[PDB]
RNA sequence: CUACCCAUGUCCAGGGUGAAGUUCAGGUAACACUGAAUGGAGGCCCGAACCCACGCACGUUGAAAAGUGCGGGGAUGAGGUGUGGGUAGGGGUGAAAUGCCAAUCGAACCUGGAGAUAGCUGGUUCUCUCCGAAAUAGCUUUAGGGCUAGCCUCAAGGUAAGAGUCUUGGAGGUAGAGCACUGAUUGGACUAGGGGCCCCUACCGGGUUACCGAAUUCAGUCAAACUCCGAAUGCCAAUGACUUAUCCUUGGGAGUCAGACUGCGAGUGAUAAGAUCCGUAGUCGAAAGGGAAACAGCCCAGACCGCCAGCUAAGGUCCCAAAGUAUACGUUAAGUGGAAAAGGAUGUGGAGUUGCUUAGACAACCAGGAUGUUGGCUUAGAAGCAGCCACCAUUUAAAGAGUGCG
RNA sequence: UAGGCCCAGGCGACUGUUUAGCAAAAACACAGGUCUCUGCGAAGCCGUAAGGCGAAGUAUAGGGGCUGACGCCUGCCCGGU
RNA sequence: UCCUAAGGUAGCGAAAUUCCUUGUCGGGUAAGUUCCGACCCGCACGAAAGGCGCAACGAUCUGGGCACUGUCUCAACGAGAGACUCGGUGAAAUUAUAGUACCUGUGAAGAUGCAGGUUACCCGCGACAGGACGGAAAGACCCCGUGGAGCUUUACUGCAGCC
RNA sequence: CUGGGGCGGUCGCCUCCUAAAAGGUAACGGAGGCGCCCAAAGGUUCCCUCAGAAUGGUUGGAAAUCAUUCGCAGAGUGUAAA
RNA sequence: AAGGGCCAUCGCUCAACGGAUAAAAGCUACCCCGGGGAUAACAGGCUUAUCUCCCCCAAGAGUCCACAUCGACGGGGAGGUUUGGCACCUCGAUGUCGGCUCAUCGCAUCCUGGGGCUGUAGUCGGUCCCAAGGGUUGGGCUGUUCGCCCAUUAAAGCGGUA
RNA sequence: UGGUGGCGAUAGCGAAGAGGUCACACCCGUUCCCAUACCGAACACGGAAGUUAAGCUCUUCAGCGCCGAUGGUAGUCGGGGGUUUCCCCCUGUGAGAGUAGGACGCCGCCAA
RNA sequence: GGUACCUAACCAGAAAGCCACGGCUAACUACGUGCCAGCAGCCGCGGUAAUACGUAGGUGGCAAGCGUUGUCCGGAAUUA
RNA sequence: GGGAGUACGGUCGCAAGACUGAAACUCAAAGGAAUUGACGGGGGCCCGCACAAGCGGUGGAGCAUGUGGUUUAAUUCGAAGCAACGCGAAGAACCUUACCAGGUCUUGACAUCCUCUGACAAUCCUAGAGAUAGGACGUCCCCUUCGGGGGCAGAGUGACAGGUGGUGCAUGGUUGUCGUCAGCUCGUGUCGUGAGAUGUUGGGUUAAGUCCCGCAACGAGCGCAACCCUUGAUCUUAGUUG
RNA sequence: CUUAUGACCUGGGCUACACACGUGCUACAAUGGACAGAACAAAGGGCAGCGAAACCGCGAGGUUAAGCCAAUCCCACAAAUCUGUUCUCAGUUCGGAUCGCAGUCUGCAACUCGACUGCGUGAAGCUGGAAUCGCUAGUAAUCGCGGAUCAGCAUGCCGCG
RNA sequence: GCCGAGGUGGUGGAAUUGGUAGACACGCUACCUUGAGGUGGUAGUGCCCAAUAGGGCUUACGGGUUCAAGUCCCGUCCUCGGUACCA
RNA sequence: GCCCGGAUAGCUCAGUUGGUAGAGCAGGGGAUUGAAAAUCCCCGUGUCCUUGGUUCGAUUCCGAGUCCGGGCACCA
RNA sequence: CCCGGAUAGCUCAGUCGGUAGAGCAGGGGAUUGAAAAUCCCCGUGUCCUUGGUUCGAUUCCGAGUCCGGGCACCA
């Protein structure tokens, strides 16, 4: 029945349209106030360091280095050493 | 007798209860009305005779083929009975039960067809000798009955044709075994492909995992309806040999068609039955004797008949109860043997392996019971000790931050 | 030697009758209700005719079925029979 | 919303119907599977197979209370009629022969009789009935017979009778 | 018929397994058929492979059709089974 | 000539299919009669699926602690009362449930005696073990057996024995 | 060498080569007989440029396939016995599997 | 009971409150408040400017008392 | 007034129910006639593109545009039947502009005060997205009888300033709307205890309370129309850039 | 309310879009399409405002520039119409969205987010369901033009024939 | 327990014949109508993707047979109608 | 006198021998109104009774009051 | 064995030789502040197939399916 509460709680992503209360939390190489997003390949947490990949657009993914997606990168210049702050 | 019914006489002790009326008085215009007295109706009441059977008790080879005892319901009417008649069995009759119709009744009674029929049950008498079975198959409104075939006896034949063993020759696909077909199924390697973390992002560009994974091959099992394989036997053979005589044909006559149990081969079941359905083999049935204490069905063995003789089988040999307290070697100690398991067990017997093992073990005695670091957390502490985490290392003859314990 | 009484309850209204000789009632009967047959040689019955029951009767009568005094009541379906 | 020729109205309702059940809820009792009062998820009540309610009635039938009681705890005693005893008369069902112990064990599976043991002098009499599958009735239930008789209707062929 | 009858299920044929390496053998024991169909689906004559897979390819896709190898067999055998 | 045979021949789920007739279904508790333990219910018998009684392995619960107490998924048995299988004796009769009457027998024990462990302070207790000599209440309902209930008692035992 | 038989693939595939003057083959063409559901692919018809590559034969080898012992075992006809869903002992029989091995051809007939 | 009383001496020293304040009914403003908290005998007041709630100021009422309460009569000619 | 002709108790009846007949409770009112109104699937008269008789479109199609919803950091706020929806917007690239993010700033961007001190500026420089800065140079205030005044600037200071913050159910003002529909009242007189009624109704007409007649009413006022413009004819005067 | 609900700047947004709604134009064609010729208005506007003619660009326009503070000059050559030519009934020689490339203007700047050409591309649609809306004579419909508004932008609204 | 029938769009219910539908009605869905309702009028309306075309998915569930299966065949599960008898 | 537990949102109630905290309703948030109801949704919104206390966080663990809830004692 | 039904989409009629007829439905029309129910219009038919008589002939004989009512054979 509390697993059904986990079924009924789908709607906590619904406060992640219309903005969320966010600081500059992913500090981008000492430079603040830049468009970054949390990587869905693997979650950026302070294990190994976290690296921002300059995408073609639509945001910057903080791919959490030691990931199979971040390791096989063509155009390594797009990776940016950023801070977890 | 009884069931109603038809004409006909006949009986019912007493007490209670009191309507319809009636009359009088009152009352009203007058009938309604009212009160007294009278009158006495009633499938009315209580209770005898008299009917009638409800409730127990007694009876039940009874006093009695339905009673008596102590009490009970009707007892002036749908009543009770006496006498004289009526209705007849596939009918009568019935305030109805299928009750009564002569101690009879879901069709009375009596002699008749009639010695009915009965595939059912009981019974079937004098003796020996001669050989002697079956309980299954098919079909059947049959399934406990029957006929044909199977198996037995009697007669006559053709005659050695039969059976057993050895011999060579096959047909056949179980038990077993195999996994090559069929299915089932283990595990690894490998992987098309598939989504998924999802990245870059037109479900489009590709990366990725133990997220799966068809195929793929490597090893691995498994079968009543899986066979590339495939025995023993059992069966049809030819062929001679040996030892045996029994087969077939024709004909008279049958009985048997409910079977049991023990072992192996299966099914049904619960790998339950002294269960059931069969296979092939026994016994019993139809077979006494001896053992299994006694006991159809197991283990021996077939009974013409007599003896106050002899030998063996199964099983027995201390005593019932005939036979060795024989003989050799072991084994149990439980009365196991004389009841049964998973499993538990320093019970013991005989093996084999190998560690320890007089520069001396085992048990026990005496001392050693460390260092880094009395470790530090979660916590108010843990010298491991609410419990981790490095399975660390030198002091030393030797001590693990540890067997444990609290 | 001649009532035991009181509270309720269904079932039968009631007195009556049968299971001679297991079973007396909650069954039958019953008055009343009721639909229907039947115009008189009625219908129905006995049973192949007669004959004289019904009835020396005549729809306010007589057979038959269905229920059961009285009081309140008896609604729906004509497709099948 | 499908289906009917039409979908149960009045009054009753765990009922002489009710399975689950002793339904639940209340009075009766210290305690009440029955009984009464109400409840309706009426398995399967219902209107002349009649529905409900009914004062009077019954050797009906369930339940409760008083009265009084050997019905009972818990038996006792007394009268008499059988019983036993002494003369009189004197049957009957039944009955293989019968000097008939009881434990196990076996067996047509539940012994008086056989086997193993155990105990027991012979013979009556008064009582009890555990047993002889004690007697009386070739089972009334149950299944077969190609039995049988009453009953039944849209089984079959018939017939009477009215058409 | 019947592991007492009742109801329920079945009744003859064909194939398999039980069946015990010949044939046969039962159970209300295990599995499925049949009351046909065909005028070519027979008769002969002569002819020639199949099932998938793997590729290559319009529409075409896992799966139409074309080749193309590898394929004694996995298919096809009027219809159940051996 | 009729009609008959011969031959070819068609009409039947006569399906219960070797087809008794061209043509067929019901109840008996109102019951008979011949038969059967060939064939049931009641009991006996064999077996033990089911049925209570034990145990085995132990994950776990029990603060820790498997083993005071419970013990899952699982295995193995013993008992022959129950629901049942089989149809062996009994259908020329073995009367069947429940109470009353007289009790008898086993022990897996309910009290009483003895003890061991305990999560046994004490008083009660739980649990196995030795014990069958003695006892085991009285009622309302139910035909009751069982069980509920009231009230006690030290205890309100279970199971045979047709 | 060719044609044609018989012998359980011990005759098989599989790979490695060799050979062709004739022989046998592909190979060259459809005018004709005949033809492919469409065709000279095959079947028919006829021809001989070059071709040993294919097949055809001739050799090697054991990689698969195939054949196949001995030894023992399973199971087992009968003989008895024991704790009786099974099992032991004796006489006799005797596989499969697994190997040792054999084998990548033998025997005929006719033409040259 | 030396009580009433009277005589003299003493001090602004000892000593006021509750009720009302929209209309009935004499007397009102300011804050708080926002169908909530609360008033109410009668009509009825408050969903953001409450003279009607609560508070403060200020009035008014009456006084050692004032309001509310339950009674009985009256107004009620509304038992005539 | 409801509770109610109900319950209960009793009589009466064959029953259905009649007759006698309450109460606890609850609202401050339920009803009586009358008047002005509004409505009528009531009547009579009568009007407008209302309907009929026609024309042309909207609803399908793309596209512009407007609000919905939804969507986002925000999609600024208001208008919501006709009488909001090409509307405020007679013009959203920044400006507008409020909204959202970042950068800011705090007598203020803007107004009076008050205290001074002098013109501030202008520019280029580096910043920086820019606001804002820091700077450089350049700061030149006028009018006066010399004190002052007039600004302009900055520095201050508290006053205040500011709000496109909220309520159009506090409001002025402003327009739509019934509709350019034919109506709404007053003064005096009476009428009726009073509310109100007459005048305005009756008759005849009109686009109309237009107007006439009648009339217990006579009158007046706001409305209608008219005078105001435009267009439609002509004359006078005036003729250029006609 | 107040070192913020006030002020300033950048940039975003008011223009989003699965989907309905009003309100407007351009169309679905032969009374049309295409080309050429011919002719005809009213009203309004113009000083950092109009811009002629002229030349150059396929063109939108560029270039320079007369004239005009206006019945003088410019916006402005009106369109429908008329007459020829061609088109022949189909998703086309109608449609003109959507979209690509190449351009021009204004302005600091046209990406979100402007208008207009030049080239291409060429869908939806072949008179639209129930229901509804306007209109009594220069109105119905139809065709162009002017202006406010604005640097820039109209299928919008006024106003004109 | 045994038989007999039947398992469905949001819902009720036909398609029970061999070839594909998931009728038809009622929902529901946007619009039209009304001042907003109910009502009435067109349009679709099984689930899910493609605003389109189309495809997937399916008629309790599970498996077979078929070129096919809501249906054919069989197992499970659910719910109705009938039976559970004689001592 | 004695001891034994609860002293939790606005209200009910979960956290319990140690994870600061939920849930329900109420209430508030705005869309829309005079504001309500209706429709659209949003939000926990707590001196864990205080005083102390071993601290490397405690609503719970401990004492200390207070308080509530108890049952035993104390007969003048 | 006889008798009953073979057309328009459908339900149904219907000539003695010369041909397409109703009703319901389909399609639209007007009608109506909407709606059915009415009110008109055309629609669509080898009159079952095959031969024959005859000038061709639903017409009408020569030749036959399938549904209902019966007499009555059925071993």
UniProtKB/Swiss-Prot annotation:
Belongs to the RelA/SpoT family. The chain holds residues 562 to 646 of 734 of the full protein. In eubacteria ppGpp (guanosine 3'-diphosphate 5'-diphosphate) is a mediator of the stringent response that coordinates a variety of cellular activities in response to changes in nutritional abundance. This enzyme catalyzes the formation of pppGpp which is then hydrolyzed to form ppGpp, it is probably the hydrolysis activity that is required for optimal growth. Homodimer. At very low potassium concentrations, when intracellular levels of c-di-AMP are low, interacts with apo-DarB. c-di-AMP inhibits the binding of DarB to RelA. Residues 1-23 are annotated as: Disordered. Disruption phenotype: Decreased growth rate; growth is almost completely restored in a triple relA-yjbM-ywaC mutant. The gene is relA. It comes from the Bacteria. This is GTP pyrophosphokinase. Transmembrane segments: none annotated.
């Amino acid at each position: 029945e509390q697993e059904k509460i986990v079924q009924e709680v789908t709607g906590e992503p619904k406060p992640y349209p219309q903005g969320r209360k966010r600081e500059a939390g992913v500090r981008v190489k000492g430079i603040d106030n830049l468009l970054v997003r949390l990587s869905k390949c693997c979650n950026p947490v302070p294990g190994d360091d976290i690296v921002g990949f300059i995408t073609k657009g639509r945001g910057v993914s903080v791919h959490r280095e030691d990931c199979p997606n971040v390791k096989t990168n063509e155009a390594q210049e797009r990776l940016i050493p950023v801070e977890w702050e």
